[PDB]
Amino acid sequence: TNSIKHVISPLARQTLQDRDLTRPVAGKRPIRLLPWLQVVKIGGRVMDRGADAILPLVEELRKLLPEHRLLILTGAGVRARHVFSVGLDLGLPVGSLAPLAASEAGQNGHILAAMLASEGVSYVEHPTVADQLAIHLSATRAVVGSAFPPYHHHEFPGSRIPPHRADTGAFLLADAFGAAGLTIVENVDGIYTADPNGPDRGQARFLPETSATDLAKSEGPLPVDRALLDVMATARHIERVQVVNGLVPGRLTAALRGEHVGTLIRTGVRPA
Amino acid sequence: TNSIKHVISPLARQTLQDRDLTRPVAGKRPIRLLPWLQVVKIGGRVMDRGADAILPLVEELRKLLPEHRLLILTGAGVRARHVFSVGLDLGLPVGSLAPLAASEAGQNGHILAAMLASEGVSYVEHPTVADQLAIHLSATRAVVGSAFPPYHHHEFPGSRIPPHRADTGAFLLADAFGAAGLTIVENVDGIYTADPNGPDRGQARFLPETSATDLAKSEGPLPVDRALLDVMATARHIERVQVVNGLVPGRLTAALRGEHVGTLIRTGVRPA
Amino acid sequence: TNSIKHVISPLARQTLQDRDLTRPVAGKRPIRLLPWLQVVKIGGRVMDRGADAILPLVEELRKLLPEHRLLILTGAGVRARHVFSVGLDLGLPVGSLAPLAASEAGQNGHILAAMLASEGVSYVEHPTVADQLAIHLSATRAVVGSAFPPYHHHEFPGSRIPPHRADTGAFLLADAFGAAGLTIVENVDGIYTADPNGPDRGQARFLPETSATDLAKSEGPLPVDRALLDVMATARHIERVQVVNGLVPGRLTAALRGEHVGTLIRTGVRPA
Amino acid sequence: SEGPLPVDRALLDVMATARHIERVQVVNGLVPGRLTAALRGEHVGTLIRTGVRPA
Amino acid sequence: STAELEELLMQRSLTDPQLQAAAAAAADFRILPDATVIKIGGQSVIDRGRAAVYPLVDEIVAARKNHKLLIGTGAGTRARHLYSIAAGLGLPAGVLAQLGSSVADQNAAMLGQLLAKHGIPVVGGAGLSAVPLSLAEVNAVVFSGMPPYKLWMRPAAEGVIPPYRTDAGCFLLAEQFGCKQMIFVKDEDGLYTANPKTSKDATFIPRISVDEMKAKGLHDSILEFPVLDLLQSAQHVREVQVVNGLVPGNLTRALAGEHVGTIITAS
Amino acid sequence: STAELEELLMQRSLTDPQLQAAAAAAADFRILPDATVIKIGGQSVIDRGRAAVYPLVDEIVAARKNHKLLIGTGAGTRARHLYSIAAGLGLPAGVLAQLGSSVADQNAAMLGQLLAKHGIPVVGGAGLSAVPLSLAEVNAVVFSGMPPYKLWMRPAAEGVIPPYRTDAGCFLLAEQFGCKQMIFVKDEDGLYTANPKTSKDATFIPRISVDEMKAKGLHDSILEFPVLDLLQSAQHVREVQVVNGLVPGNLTRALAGEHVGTIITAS
Numbered sequence A, B, C: 001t002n003s004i005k006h007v008i009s010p011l012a013r014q015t016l017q018d019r020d021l022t023r024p025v026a027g028k029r030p031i032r033l034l035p036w037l038q039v040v041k042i043g044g045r046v047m048d049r050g051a052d053a054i055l056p057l058v059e060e061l062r063k064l065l066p067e068h069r070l071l072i073l074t075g076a077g078v079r080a081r082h083v084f085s086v087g088l089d090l091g092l093p094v095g096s097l098a099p100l101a102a103s104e105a106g107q108n109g110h111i112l113a114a115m116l117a118s119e120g121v122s123y124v125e126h127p128t129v130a131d132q133l134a135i136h137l138s139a140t141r142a143v144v145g146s147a148f149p150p151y152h153h154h155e156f157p158g159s160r161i162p163p164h165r166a167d168t169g170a171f172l173l174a175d176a177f178g179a180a181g182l183t184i185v186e187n188v189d190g191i192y193t194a195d196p197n198g199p200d201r202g203q204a205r206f207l208p209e210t211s212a213t214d215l216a217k218s219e220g221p222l223p224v225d226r227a228l229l230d231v232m233a234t235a236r237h238i239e240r241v242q243v244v245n246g247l248v249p250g251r252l253t254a255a256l257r258g259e260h261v262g263t264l265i266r267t268g269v270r271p272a
Numbered sequence D: 001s002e003g004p005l006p007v008d009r010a011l012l013d014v015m016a017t018a019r020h021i022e023r024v025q026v027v028n029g030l031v032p033g034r035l036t037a038a039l040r041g042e043h044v045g046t047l048i049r050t051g052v053r054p055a
Numbered sequence E, F: 001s002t003a004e005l006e007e008l009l010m011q012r013s014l015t016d017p018q019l020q021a022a023a024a025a026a027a028d029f030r031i032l033p034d035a036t037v038i039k040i041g042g043q044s045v046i047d048r049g050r051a052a053v054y055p056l057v058d059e060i061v062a063a064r065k066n067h068k069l070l071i072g073t074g075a076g077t078r079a080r081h082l083y084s085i086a087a088g089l090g091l092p093a094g095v096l097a098q099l100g101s102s103v104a105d106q107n108a109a110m111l112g113q114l115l116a117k118h119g120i121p122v123v124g125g126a127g128l129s130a131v132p133l134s135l136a137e138v139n140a141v142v143f144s145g146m147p148p149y150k151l152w153m154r155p156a157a158e159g160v161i162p163p164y165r166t167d168a169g170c171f172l173l174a175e176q177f178g179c180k181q182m183i184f185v186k187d188e189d190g191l192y193t194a195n196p197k198t199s200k201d202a203t204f205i206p207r208i209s210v211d212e213m214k215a216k217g218l219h220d221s222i223l224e225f226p227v228l229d230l231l232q233s234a235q236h237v238r239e240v241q242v243v244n245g246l247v248p249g250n251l252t253r254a255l256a257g258e259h260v261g262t263i264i265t266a267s
């Protein structure tokens, strides 16, 4: 006798690969875990600008604490580009560069959290965010974390640059939590038809509204991860993500109230 | 070889095995660490029933948050029986099976806490429970933890089944804290003279009240760990523990108010 | 090609050892991270006196919880002297004795925190103090930590006794945070001209007011670490630290309100 | 009953029309711990059953 | 040039096609080129208990004399129970992911205790674990095969079942470390035209590519379907073999490069 | 049967005598059958300093060439000071247990530093035990002897002193891993009729069973009394040995199989 010892359950014995056999059990829309949460992603390039950009943003965030329950997630920025330069020079694979770039996002989080410490804000770690965010947002009005996901050496291969970066990790968290929204804070007004700081800037036209699918079919650079558009197609809760200019005071506050001040990205989720 | 270097203390030089030499120093009843705490143990078999049982219990727990300061501890259930079946087939000792079964109690805790995340409830780890429960119950109204104790490979030998399980761990915690009470949430009305779901259920007579010493002299099966009765004999604070049916809405709420809706187990603790 | 791959920054390419090159970037006085914080250091020898000294201190701390935001840090005491006796007998270096002595400071912290658990006070670990003190002091009114710094095997050589002990670690934290003050709770009235419990106790005279510079040029024993005077010379925020007798109820409360009830130590800070 | 009581006689009248509270305990406040016990449902005094029939 | 790559890295978005192409020309370093990642099945092997695990333990102890092994564990029926409870509550894939990781952790602990007397340990090596692999007395480690995505798990197009589980966790380990081989040790001779337990009529498939496998439109598979896409994007592990661990010697022969089961190639 | 055991495990309470009897018939696997657990005394050895620790370190380094050792540390006088302070405050046994663990941690760190240049590590995750024990160059690990019960410590019948301390922590590790022997290395020739330091006419007991030892009604003992009950319920370690570590060669002779000191048998 060498049979499989099974636990009686509606998913027992099956592989979970047959979508016809798993649909009766798990094929439903998930619930919202933290429906009152607002997730704000701060771009690493915004943090790279130093006090000239961080100080006004800290003041805006300070005045937002009595209004929203905030999960603030920081990007990586230029320092991740250098560890890519060294890592690619050493030939390291994409799963090696993913945690190296994530470290710079965490350091940006410690910097931002320190500026808000007097308001009761501190940086929290990924296991704390994944399992104990509820208790931490009951203790204080906002916490800071790294926007990068903990994919590490399990990062997807294909490109030598880690695909699941700050925008993608922040959206995965916001949608899994069923949060009230995700706002991406950029160093530009939003998404353009070309790089507004690149070689073809003269033809860049500002896009006030767009769909993730249309941007996924796009060719050329974007201010957000291309993997963000891919996880937006499988989103379950968040219907829109707005990219706003964090260098203009008040736009983050306006975006958190649903006001159109940047580029609105429509996900694959429709209302009910 | 050369003399012991002692620190002068009332217990210095002692082996601590002589009860006559240790009694003047440590023989007194301990203080209560968290006298306002209410501990609730949710049976693993209750969680095994899925949404049909979890959803009504989550709603009852939601209404209890403004009334009590709750430490919610989850048991293991049927999944620990399977890891026992595989582990015993592999010949693994009891200290190996103890942390494997505890894992299922932890997973039940993550499941229950996720359902209450929107209320500020999160799963907390054993070191957090042992050393930081006070600050966590100051941040939020309730936390969820694993009811199994961290005995691990230091589990007691004798039985091939780990004796210090969810009921025992929850009571050890509640009594060490000096909590206001421990309520055990079961899938049956309480303790019977026989298994009300077993072959002799026709003989099963409900016991509205019993003593831990009378139950320890029994031989038949029980809905609680037999080690629970042992640690009840040496308890210091909790005088009674009620086993109530979590499948009947309102019984947990009633038990937390001292109302007799299940089986009351008298411990060895005493006086007014 | 072997050139250094630089990130363009105000401190790029330079070694950070040229004080003339680093001053235009980092030469300013830092901000205060937690200006509303009050740090209280409890001497290990105070805890060594047991319930006769701890119970009145706990009652005084209990009444201070609604008045201040407290970071309570505990010293090591006599048990560290024993681990020094065994460690030095074994010939262990100073970097090995430092974490061993720090363990006794942590144990004193767990003891004191347990007595205040019913008030919501818990012991928190050094990484928690270093990165998440703000959220924890938003959850509860006070937290307890070890006053020893995590210098570990990187402790400074020179003396066979670890120099960076409880007083030094408490001040390093308090000044780095920019806290409103640091109060050192001793088993004596303050600093004397000689050890008031030593062989020359008949010569000891009370010093109501001292400066860290004059104490550092002193030779002979002090109730505080000599490294405390060194870090006081480079302090950035805290201008004075008071050493008060914790065996006299009310002196800690008075010192936290700026009342002169012990020995004042003027640091190197004169903001001009 | 006729004769004196430690509670208002009107308390018994409003207990007959009670809608929620099923029992009220009278405990000795001069004995420390009895109020704490009564708030936890422990029987340390006199239990008065109201008109609310429990399920 | 590296100068243009470094220039693009500093002046362009990481989404810029110019940057992506320059990074693709970087050197390719294999961290553990001499090691082999094997997955010990959860539901297919470990859930069978002693009759299946004990022979494979003896085979592993003998095989580590000649091959460096990173031994990943599946989860199995206990994860399916957890998935059923959580799915019935409407919990998202990210929550189910952490639940499944615990089951793979349990299996790794049980396998490690049977291998402890042989020096083979259970690892959570954050920076790899070079010492136990390096030593001829050990030459093997046991790890939990679930990916670390946790709440950041990418959901499937439909449903809350995490699409990346212990198949993807072990494969991405082999790909990241540049391992020479990835062997899935389960309970069937290999890939069949259908589930061989539920279709008596299934035919064994000794060799197939990802494109051919997708064209057949399989309702069920011996491997997680997203792994086929990870395989096509992989830089180091361009094929995998699925072998029957219930037949002694299949793992040893597969480690030596023999074709004893189904070989699934990226191209 | 396994079929009987698997049916009982899923349909009955774990307290059911039928389930308990069926589980007792399961096979018995020893995780580290060739290893020996030794306790280096805390108050009896390590608190004595160099004159006691240094010769035992030399003996351990020599003994590990022939014997695989798990070296557990006692706590000692610093724990008694902690217990005194905490007991004076009325803190429960679960709080005292955590305090005592730190002292045994200190002793493990000090002993491990003296053995670091010999390759012997201080281990404390469970996970670091497999590699160094297998390596003949190492063949030993140091661990802290306090049990992990923490606030979940079972209290004694009277008082707040934790009844399971470094004697029980060392013994239960020997029992769990199926080690071949447990040797307590302290500062007396063995068990006596009474505390030999305070009773001058105490008589040395070379051998005794747990039942006869409990029959004596000893006021004091060289081992924690609850360990006698753990010994009687043990599946693998059915006797313990207590030797005088202050006499050179006593530990080596005990490892060679000589009945140096006192042997306490479960039956």
Ligand SMILES: Nc1ncnc2c1ncn2[C@@H]1O[C@H](COP(=O)(O)OP(=O)(O)OP(=O)(O)O)[C@@H](O)[C@H]1O
Pocket (backbone or CB within 6 Å): A042, A043, A044, A045, A046, A074, A075, A076, A077, A165, A166, A167, A186, A187, A188, A190, A191, A192, A193, A194, A195, A196, A197, A198, A220, A221, A222, A223, A224, E012, E013, E014
């Ligand atoms: N289509 C586009 N629309 C707008 N900006 C673009 C576009 N393509 C490229 N960019 C450029 O990308 C820049 C933003 O870079 P990026 O998104 O990498 O930084 P970040 O998001 O702050 O960093 P991180 O992702 O590490 O948080 C803008 O300054 C802009 O010049």
Ligand SMILES: Nc1ncnc2c1ncn2[C@@H]1O[C@H](COP(=O)(O)OP(=O)(O)OP(=O)(O)O)[C@@H](O)[C@H]1O
Pocket (backbone or CB within 6 Å): B042, B043, B044, B045, B046, B074, B075, B076, B077, B165, B166, B167, B186, B187, B188, B190, B191, B192, B193, B194, B195, B196, B197, B198, B220, B221, B222, B223, B224, F012, F013, F014
């Ligand atoms: N004397 C008894 N009285 C009542 N129930 C009994 C008795 N003996 C056996 N049982 C059975 O035990 C069952 C409860 O099982 P058990 O206590 O193992 O689950 P649980 O407590 O939810 O799980 P866990 O201990 O992992 O939290 C009841 O459904 C009942 O059928």
Ligand SMILES: Nc1ncnc2c1ncn2[C@@H]1O[C@H](COP(=O)(O)OP(=O)(O)OP(=O)(O)O)[C@@H](O)[C@H]1O
Pocket (backbone or CB within 6 Å): C042, C043, C044, C045, C046, C074, C075, C076, C077, C165, C166, C167, C186, C187, C188, C190, C191, C192, C193, C194, C195, C196, C197, C198, C220, C221, C222, C223, C224
């Ligand atoms: N110049 C001095 N003035 C006052 N006390 C002194 C002086 N020199 C030595 N002492 C002695 O030092 C004692 C305090 O000891 P110490 O500062 O080491 O303990 P502690 O600060 O409580 O412990 P820890 O530093 O571990 O927190 C006093 O009781 C006093 O006898």
Ligand SMILES: Nc1ncnc2c1ncn2[C@@H]1O[C@H](COP(=O)(O)OP(=O)(O)O)[C@@H](O)[C@H]1O
Pocket (backbone or CB within 6 Å): A013, A014, A015, A016, E040, E041, E042, E043, E044, E045, E074, E075, E076, E185, E186, E187, E188, E190, E191, E192, E193, E194, E195, E196, E197, E218, E220, E221, E222, E223
């Ligand atoms: N087309 C197929 N060819 C072969 N096996 C299949 C196929 N479809 C499903 N299976 C089944 O998938 C099982 C292995 O997957 P799974 O049950 O997830 O085990 P594991 O825990 O090892 O991943 C095999 O037992 C086999 O019966």
Ligand SMILES: Nc1ncnc2c1ncn2[C@@H]1O[C@H](COP(=O)(O)OP(=O)(O)O)[C@@H](O)[C@H]1O
Pocket (backbone or CB within 6 Å): B014, B015, B016, F040, F041, F042, F043, F044, F045, F074, F075, F076, F166, F167, F185, F186, F187, F188, F190, F191, F192, F193, F194, F195, F196, F197, F218, F220, F221, F222, F223
């Ligand atoms: N009946 C007895 N026989 C032998 N030794 C005893 C007895 N009773 C007490 N002891 C004492 O117990 C001591 C060992 O216990 P302890 O001081 O706790 O050491 P450790 O810290 O190593 O456990 C010995 O030094 C011995 O003096």
Ligand code: MOO
Pocket (backbone or CB within 6 Å): A015, A016, E042, E043, E074, E075, E076, E077, E079, E080, E100, E165, E166, E167
């Ligand atoms: O058992 Mo899994 O989670 O499908 O690998």
Ligand SMILES: [Mg+2]
Pocket (backbone or CB within 6 Å): A015, E074, E167, E224
């Ligand atoms: Mg599978």
Ligand SMILES: [Mg+2]
Pocket (backbone or CB within 6 Å): A043, A167, A186, A223, A224, A225
């Ligand atoms: Mg961007």
Ligand SMILES: [Mg+2]
Pocket (backbone or CB within 6 Å): B015, F074, F167, F224
């Ligand atoms: Mg002892």
Ligand SMILES: [Mg+2]
Pocket (backbone or CB within 6 Å): B043, B167, B186, B223, B224, B225
């Ligand atoms: Mg039960």
Ligand SMILES: [Mg+2]
Pocket (backbone or CB within 6 Å): C015
């Ligand atoms: Mg330098």
Ligand SMILES: [Mg+2]
Pocket (backbone or CB within 6 Å): C043, C167, C186, C223, C224, C225
């Ligand atoms: Mg001092």
Ligand SMILES: [Mg+2]
Pocket (backbone or CB within 6 Å): D006, D007, D008
């Ligand atoms: Mg009255």
